[PDB]
Amino acid sequence: APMNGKSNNCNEIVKIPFDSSCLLGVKLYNCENKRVNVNSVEAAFITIDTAF
Amino acid sequence: TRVHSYRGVLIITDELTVEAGSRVSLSGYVSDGGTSDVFTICRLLD
Protein backbone atom coordinates (compact mmCIF):
# COMPACT_ATOMS: atom_id res chain seq x y z
CA ALA A 1 0.00 0.00 0.00
CA PRO A 2 2.30 2.82 -1.15
CA MET A 3 1.03 6.26 -0.19
CA ASN A 4 2.91 7.83 -3.13
CA GLY A 5 1.54 5.59 -5.89
CA LYS A 6 3.43 2.72 -7.49
CA SER A 7 6.50 -0.91 -14.10
CA ASN A 8 2.77 -0.15 -14.14
CA ASN A 9 1.87 -3.03 -16.49
CA CYS A 10 -1.38 -4.67 -15.35
CA ASN A 11 -2.21 -5.20 -11.68
CA GLU A 12 -2.54 -8.80 -10.53
CA ILE A 13 -5.82 -10.28 -9.32
CA VAL A 14 -5.97 -11.27 -5.66
CA LYS A 15 -7.58 -14.72 -5.46
CA ILE A 16 -9.37 -15.71 -2.25
CA PRO A 17 -10.93 -19.21 -2.17
CA PHE A 18 -14.70 -18.69 -2.02
CA ASP A 19 -15.86 -19.64 1.46
CA SER A 20 -12.98 -20.07 3.94
CA SER A 21 -11.79 -16.95 5.76
CA CYS A 22 -8.87 -14.86 4.53
CA LEU A 23 -7.06 -12.13 6.47
CA LEU A 24 -6.25 -9.12 4.30
CA GLY A 25 -2.81 -7.78 5.16
CA VAL A 26 -2.38 -4.12 4.23
CA LYS A 27 1.06 -2.62 4.86
CA LEU A 28 1.25 1.17 5.14
CA TYR A 29 4.33 2.45 3.32
CA ASN A 30 4.92 6.10 4.14
CA CYS A 31 5.05 8.44 1.20
CA GLU A 32 8.68 8.47 0.33
CA ASN A 33 9.33 4.74 0.26
CA LYS A 34 9.29 3.47 3.88
CA ARG A 35 7.08 1.42 6.16
CA VAL A 36 5.10 3.56 8.57
CA ASN A 37 3.25 2.56 11.71
CA VAL A 38 -0.53 2.55 11.71
CA ASN A 39 -0.78 5.96 13.36
CA SER A 40 -3.09 8.98 12.98
CA VAL A 41 -5.64 6.70 11.28
CA GLU A 42 -8.48 6.10 13.72
CA ALA A 43 -10.91 4.47 11.28
CA ALA A 44 -10.19 2.17 8.35
CA PHE A 45 -12.92 0.89 6.05
CA ILE A 46 -12.92 -1.89 3.46
CA THR A 47 -15.47 -1.05 0.77
CA ILE A 48 -15.40 -3.86 -1.82
CA ASP A 49 -17.43 -2.46 -4.70
CA THR A 50 -21.24 -2.77 -4.46
CA ALA A 51 -20.90 -5.65 -2.02
CA PHE A 52 -20.49 -4.32 1.52
CA THR B 1 30.90 4.85 108.16
CA ARG B 2 28.47 6.60 105.80
CA VAL B 3 27.89 4.25 102.84
CA HIS B 4 25.79 7.12 101.46
CA SER B 5 25.50 7.01 97.67
CA TYR B 6 24.55 9.46 94.91
CA ARG B 7 22.46 9.50 91.73
CA GLY B 8 22.98 10.64 88.15
CA VAL B 9 21.20 11.14 84.84
CA LEU B 10 20.38 8.59 82.15
CA ILE B 11 22.92 9.27 79.39
CA ILE B 12 22.73 7.16 76.23
CA THR B 13 24.57 7.34 72.91
CA ASP B 14 23.27 6.03 69.59
CA GLU B 15 24.22 6.51 65.95
CA LEU B 16 21.30 6.82 63.53
CA THR B 17 21.37 6.86 59.73
CA VAL B 18 18.57 6.65 57.16
CA GLU B 19 19.31 5.86 53.51
CA ALA B 20 17.43 5.65 50.22
CA GLY B 21 18.03 4.59 46.63
CA SER B 22 17.42 5.52 43.02
CA ARG B 23 16.60 3.80 39.75
CA VAL B 24 16.07 5.29 36.29
CA SER B 25 13.58 3.63 33.95
CA LEU B 26 13.50 4.34 30.21
CA SER B 27 11.31 3.01 27.41
CA GLY B 28 12.13 3.74 23.78
CA TYR B 29 11.88 2.16 20.37
CA VAL B 30 13.04 2.70 16.80
CA SER B 31 11.01 5.36 15.03
CA ASP B 32 8.55 3.93 12.49
CA GLY B 33 7.02 7.22 11.41
CA GLY B 34 5.17 9.17 14.09
CA THR B 35 1.75 10.57 14.99
CA SER B 36 1.09 13.11 12.23
CA ASP B 37 -1.69 15.58 11.46
CA VAL B 38 -3.66 15.28 8.21
CA PHE B 39 -2.44 11.78 7.29
CA THR B 40 -3.38 11.76 3.61
CA ILE B 41 -2.01 10.30 0.40
CA CYS B 42 0.21 12.71 -1.51
CA ARG B 43 1.62 13.23 -5.02
CA LEU B 44 4.93 15.11 -4.94
CA LEU B 45 6.17 16.98 -8.01
CA ASP B 46 9.46 18.67 -8.86
- Using a CB–CB cutoff of 8 Å, tell me whether A6 touches chain B: no
Measured distance CA(A38)–CA(A44) in Å, rounded: 10
Cα A36 off chain centre by? 14
For β-strands A29-30 and A34-35, DSSP reports them as antiparallel
Q: Under a CB-based contact definition with an 8 Å cutoff, are residues A2 and A33 in contact?
A: yes
Nearest to A39 among B35, B41, B43 (CB): B35
Q: Select from A34, A39, A41, A42 the residue whose CB has the most chain B CBs within 10 Å, as the one to mutate to test that interface.
A: A39
Query: Which residues lie across from A34 on neighbouring strands?
Result: A30
Q: Please report the sign of the dihedral spanned by the C-alpha atoms of residue A32, residue A38, residue A40, residue A43.
A: positive
Q: Which residue of A has its CA nearest to B39?
A: A40
Beta carbons within 8 Å of B43's beta carbon, 6+ residues apart: A4, A5
